[PDB]
Design an enzyme around this catalytic site. Structure first.
Site, PDB file in Angstrom:
ATOM      1  CB  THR A  78     -28.622  40.281  -5.203  1.00 45.09           C
ATOM      2  OG1 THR A  78     -29.144  41.130  -4.126  1.00 45.09           O
ATOM      3  CG2 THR A  78     -27.486  41.042  -5.922  1.00 45.09           C
TER       4      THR A  78
ATOM      5  CB  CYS B 276     -25.384  41.312   2.990  1.00 42.74           C
ATOM      6  SG  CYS B 276     -27.058  41.613   2.405  1.00 42.74           S
TER       7      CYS B 276
ATOM      8  CG  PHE C  47     -25.194  37.159   2.179  1.00 40.65           C
ATOM      9  CD1 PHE C  47     -26.191  37.862   1.534  1.00 40.65           C
ATOM     10  CD2 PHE C  47     -25.367  35.773   2.350  1.00 40.65           C
ATOM     11  CE1 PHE C  47     -27.357  37.261   1.098  1.00 40.65           C
ATOM     12  CE2 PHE C  47     -26.509  35.170   1.869  1.00 40.65           C
ATOM     13  CZ  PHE C  47     -27.503  35.893   1.261  1.00 40.65           C
TER      14      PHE C  47
HETATM   15  C1  HEM Z   1     -29.261  37.038  -2.312  1.00 33.53           C
HETATM   16  C2  HEM Z   1     -29.379  38.342  -2.077  1.00 33.53           C
HETATM   17  C3  HEM Z   1     -28.186  39.254  -1.746  1.00 33.53           C
HETATM   18  C4  HEM Z   1     -26.874  39.114  -1.973  1.00 33.53           C
HETATM   19  C5  HEM Z   1     -26.165  37.917  -2.721  1.00 33.53           C
HETATM   20  C6  HEM Z   1     -26.262  40.295  -1.425  1.00 33.53           C
HETATM   21  C7  HEM Z   1     -24.908  40.516  -1.381  1.00 33.53           C
HETATM   22  C8  HEM Z   1     -24.242  41.522  -0.768  1.00 33.53           C
HETATM   23  C9  HEM Z   1     -22.803  41.645  -0.681  1.00 33.53           C
HETATM   24  C10 HEM Z   1     -21.734  40.772  -1.331  1.00 33.53           C
HETATM   25  C11 HEM Z   1     -22.537  42.741   0.027  1.00 33.53           C
HETATM   26  C12 HEM Z   1     -21.142  43.300   0.381  1.00 33.53           C
HETATM   27  C13 HEM Z   1     -20.663  44.339  -0.654  1.00 33.53           C
HETATM   28  C14 HEM Z   1     -19.249  44.771  -0.485  1.00 33.53           C
HETATM   29  O1  HEM Z   1     -18.502  44.229   0.369  1.00 33.53           O
HETATM   30  O2  HEM Z   1     -18.861  45.709  -1.268  1.00 33.53           O
HETATM   31  C15 HEM Z   1     -23.793  43.394   0.393  1.00 33.53           C
HETATM   32  C16 HEM Z   1     -23.948  44.555   1.138  1.00 33.53           C
HETATM   33  C17 HEM Z   1     -25.148  45.168   1.343  1.00 33.53           C
HETATM   34  N1  HEM Z   1     -26.436  44.658   1.110  1.00 33.53           N
HETATM   35 FE1  HEM Z   1     -26.829  42.750   0.352  1.00 33.53          FE
HETATM   36  N2  HEM Z   1     -27.195  41.047  -0.767  1.00 33.53           N
HETATM   37  C18 HEM Z   1     -28.399  40.504  -0.935  1.00 33.53           C
HETATM   38  C19 HEM Z   1     -29.612  40.983  -0.525  1.00 33.53           C
HETATM   39  C20 HEM Z   1     -29.866  42.142   0.110  1.00 33.53           C
HETATM   40  C21 HEM Z   1     -31.127  42.693   0.505  1.00 33.53           C
HETATM   41  C22 HEM Z   1     -32.452  41.983   0.387  1.00 33.53           C
HETATM   42  C23 HEM Z   1     -30.880  43.903   1.054  1.00 33.53           C
HETATM   43  C24 HEM Z   1     -31.859  44.900   1.679  1.00 33.53           C
HETATM   44  C25 HEM Z   1     -32.993  44.543   2.242  1.00 33.53           C
HETATM   45  C26 HEM Z   1     -29.443  44.186   0.977  1.00 33.53           C
HETATM   46  C27 HEM Z   1     -28.806  45.332   1.389  1.00 33.53           C
HETATM   47  C28 HEM Z   1     -27.429  45.552   1.438  1.00 33.53           C
HETATM   48  C29 HEM Z   1     -26.782  46.711   2.053  1.00 33.53           C
HETATM   49  C30 HEM Z   1     -27.468  47.991   2.562  1.00 33.53           C
HETATM   50  C31 HEM Z   1     -25.315  46.441   2.009  1.00 33.53           C
HETATM   51  C32 HEM Z   1     -24.232  47.399   2.507  1.00 33.53           C
HETATM   52  C33 HEM Z   1     -24.114  47.065   4.000  1.00 33.53           C
HETATM   53  C34 HEM Z   1     -23.042  47.923   4.678  1.00 33.53           C
HETATM   54  O3  HEM Z   1     -21.904  47.922   4.152  1.00 33.53           O
HETATM   55  O4  HEM Z   1     -23.394  48.648   5.629  1.00 33.53           O
HETATM   56  N3  HEM Z   1     -28.850  43.080   0.386  1.00 33.53           N
HETATM   57  N4  HEM Z   1     -24.781  42.573  -0.002  1.00 33.53           N
HETATM   58  C1  LIG Z   2     -14.390  44.041 -12.890  1.00 35.39           C
HETATM   59  O1  LIG Z   2     -15.127  44.676 -11.822  1.00 35.39           O
HETATM   60  C2  LIG Z   2     -16.378  44.198 -11.412  1.00 35.39           C
HETATM   61  C3  LIG Z   2     -17.179  43.486 -12.333  1.00 35.39           C
HETATM   62  C4  LIG Z   2     -18.434  42.993 -11.964  1.00 35.39           C
HETATM   63  C5  LIG Z   2     -18.887  43.206 -10.652  1.00 35.39           C
HETATM   64  N1  LIG Z   2     -20.056  42.909 -10.052  1.00 35.39           N
HETATM   65  C6  LIG Z   2     -19.994  43.443  -8.803  1.00 35.39           C
HETATM   66  S1  LIG Z   2     -21.330  43.248  -7.757  1.00 35.39           S
HETATM   67  C7  LIG Z   2     -20.948  44.488  -6.583  1.00 35.39           C
HETATM   68  C8  LIG Z   2     -22.111  44.795  -5.626  1.00 35.39           C
HETATM   69  N2  LIG Z   2     -22.095  44.201  -4.430  1.00 35.39           N
HETATM   70  C9  LIG Z   2     -23.058  44.396  -3.550  1.00 35.39           C
HETATM   71  C10 LIG Z   2     -24.161  45.150  -3.792  1.00 35.39           C
HETATM   72  C11 LIG Z   2     -25.220  45.213  -2.688  1.00 35.39           C
HETATM   73  C12 LIG Z   2     -24.304  45.859  -5.080  1.00 35.39           C
HETATM   74  O2  LIG Z   2     -25.466  46.489  -5.415  1.00 35.39           O
HETATM   75  C13 LIG Z   2     -26.556  45.588  -5.729  1.00 35.39           C
HETATM   76  C14 LIG Z   2     -23.241  45.642  -6.059  1.00 35.39           C
HETATM   77  C15 LIG Z   2     -23.289  46.265  -7.412  1.00 35.39           C
HETATM   78  N3  LIG Z   2     -18.848  44.133  -8.537  1.00 35.39           N
HETATM   79  C16 LIG Z   2     -18.080  44.018  -9.723  1.00 35.39           C
HETATM   80  C17 LIG Z   2     -16.795  44.457 -10.098  1.00 35.39           C
END
Ligand code: HEM
Ligand SMILES: COc1ccc2nc(SCc3ncc(C)c(OC)c3C)[nH]c2c1
EC number: 1.14.14.1
Length: 450
Positions: free
Chosen positions: A263, A395, A388
């Site tokens: 990402t 995140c 995030f």
């Molecule tokens: C622009 C870069 C990134 C974006 C847009 C992004 C976005 C996200 C989002 C939307 C979530 C929440 C997912 C959910 O609610 O299902 C998430 C969770 C997470 N991300 Fe990121 N992320 C980024 C970069 C990173 C990086 C660099 C790392 C690691 C160094 C990371 C590690 C994780 C982890 C481990 C979680 C799960 C956290 C938890 O639920 O305990 N992400 N991220």
């Molecule tokens: C229709 O259902 C969908 C489609 C696309 C989608 N893209 C996503 S993005 C969901 C997501 N968020 C956070 C992390 C850290 C991650 O691993 C990189 C992923 C796969 N969820 C979707 C659900």
């Protein structure tokens, strides 16, 4: 109110609407037609797509809604396991890993990662300084070389050496194909039809390529640091006092290798795209980088000074958040927005790019790239900007991502002038995550020493 629902396909309900290479973009067009909420049904499941800040601000109330595993996350869990991304908040290994790995994102840890981030960034700059004048740059390809190498080095003290390779690293190729398969499975009514047997074999092969690299990283460390892998191997959860077991460790390594670069490569790629399409913003960004980054390599404190670059990155995340959805479930019966009653266990999906186009928040210029929207976080309504995620499931890498991207984009803008030489037309490739496909530029060195 009775919620809107896109077109149906008999017993298949809405599932065939996900038969596209670009499902998030399709869902956004649906939200354009239907508005702030719509129902989406498939055989055996229902979710509700939210697109307004009005509703999403309620969904982000952790007293009412907890993180859900979307269908997409359930399919990813096949290789992410119960690591931090794909575990339920109520599984023991969520909070346990969280407590054990959170110290790896302290400011102290970040100061310590800075030198190794510079090591990769310098490699990117030297690559581009070394191109002949006829050549061009494949932007998402190089940003993936950078970002993978950065997490490998900072996270695991392991050198993927992506800049020494002309094809994407094998780990990448398998990653992409695993994410592709998970995405493609979202539309499959009959996932056990024998027509999917090859997809299944291919998926297991890709998951093996990824786990074989995890094994090399683990064996490299055993043979050999104070990093993410050190905490995974030795760290103890203060609450329970236990360390992670071996099975969870492996899931966490794969989680972090993917979530900790894919990402961020997307973000850097979108940001450069918007900068070349918006020359006045590019000048202002370049002016800051020149003024601030006065030494041959940037310092930690200097990256922290790149405010406008920061704002460019946030505006790029506004228009194209690279993990473009997250999912919630109702903890108890509750009513959303005074209008839509939900029952305990009902699922919601936050459609992030459409939230970020809510004209009631951003104004009528929502499609314009204007970093200045981010000058003052206090002037932005609660829960309008959610690239995030939310609350205790937000995140964990946010600062790591943004530090890396701000450092690298700063150096790019210090060292080169960029040309959109092909008048590139934005084409957004979906692999659950989002990235410009085929985005190319030329970079003309300013000839400033490194
Ligand atoms: C622009 C870069 C990134 C974006 C847009 C992004 C976005 C996200 C989002 C939307 C979530 C929440 C997912 C959910 O609610 O299902 C998430 C969770 C997470 N991300 Fe990121 N992320 C980024 C970069 C990173 C990086 C660099 C790392 C690691 C160094 C990371 C590690 C994780 C982890 C481990 C979680 C799960 C956290 C938890 O639920 O305990 N992400 N991220
Ligand atoms: C229709 O259902 C969908 C489609 C696309 C989608 N893209 C996503 S993005 C969901 C997501 N968020 C956070 C992390 C850290 C991650 O691993 C990189 C992923 C796969 N969820 C979707 C659900």
């Amino acid at each position: 109110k009775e919620m809107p629902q896109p077109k149906t396909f008999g017993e298949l309900k809405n599932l065939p609407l996900l038969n596209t290479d670009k499902p998030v973009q399709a869902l956004m067009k649906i939200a354009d037609e239907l508005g702030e909420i719509f129902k989406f049904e498939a055989p055996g499941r229902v979710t509700r797509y939210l697109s307004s800040q009005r509703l999403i601000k309620e969904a982000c109330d952790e007293s009412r809604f907890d993180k859900n595993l979307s269908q997409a996350l359930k399919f990813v869990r096949d290789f992410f396991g119960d690591g931090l991304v794909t575990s339920w908040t109520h599984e023991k290994n969520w909070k346990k890993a969280h407590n054990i790995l959170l110290p790896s994102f302290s400011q102290q840890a970040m100061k310590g990662y800075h030198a190794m981030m510079v090591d990769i960034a310098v490699q990117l700059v030297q690559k581009w300084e070394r191109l002949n004048a006829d050549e061009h740059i494949e932007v998402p390809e190089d940003m993936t070389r950078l970002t993978l190498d950065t997490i490998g080095l900072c996270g695991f003290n392991y050198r993927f050496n992506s800049f020494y390779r002309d094809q994407p690293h094998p780990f990448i190729t398998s990653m992409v194909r695993a994410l592709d398969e998970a995405m493609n499975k979202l539309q499959r009514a009959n996932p056990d039809d024998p027509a999917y047997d090859e997809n299944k074999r291919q998926f297991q092969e890709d998951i093996k390529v990824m786990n074989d690299l995890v094994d090399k990283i683990i064996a490299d460390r055993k043979a050999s640091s104070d990093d993410l892998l050190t905490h995974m191997l030795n760290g103890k959860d203060p609450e329970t006092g236990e360390p992670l077991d071996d099975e969870n460790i492996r899931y966490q390594i794969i989680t972090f290798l993917i979530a900790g670069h894919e990402t961020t490569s997307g973000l850097l790629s979108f940001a450069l795209y918007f900068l070349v399409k918006n020359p006045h913003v590019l000048q202002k960004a370049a002016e800051e980088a020149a003024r601030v980054l006065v030494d041959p390599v940037p310092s930690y404190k200097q990256v922290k000074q790149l405010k406008y670059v920061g704002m460019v990155l946030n505006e790029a995340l506004r228009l194209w958040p690279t993990a473009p959805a997250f999912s919630l479930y109702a903890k108890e019966d509750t009513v959303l927005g005074g209008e839509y009653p939900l029952e305990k266990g009902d699922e919601l999906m936050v459609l992030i790019p459409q939230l970020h186009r809510d004209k009631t928040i951003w104004g009528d210029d929502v499609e314009e790239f204007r970093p200045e929207r981010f000058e003052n976080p206090s002037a932005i309504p609660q829960h309008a900007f959610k690239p995030f995620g939310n609350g205790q499931r937000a995140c964990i890498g946010q600062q790591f991502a943004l530090h890396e991207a701000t450092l690298v984009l700063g150096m790019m803008l210090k060292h080169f002038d960029f040309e959109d030489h092909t008048n590139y037309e934005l084409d957004i490739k979906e692999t659950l995550t989002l990235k410009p496909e085929g985005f190319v530029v030329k970079a003309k060195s300013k000839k400033i020493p490194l």
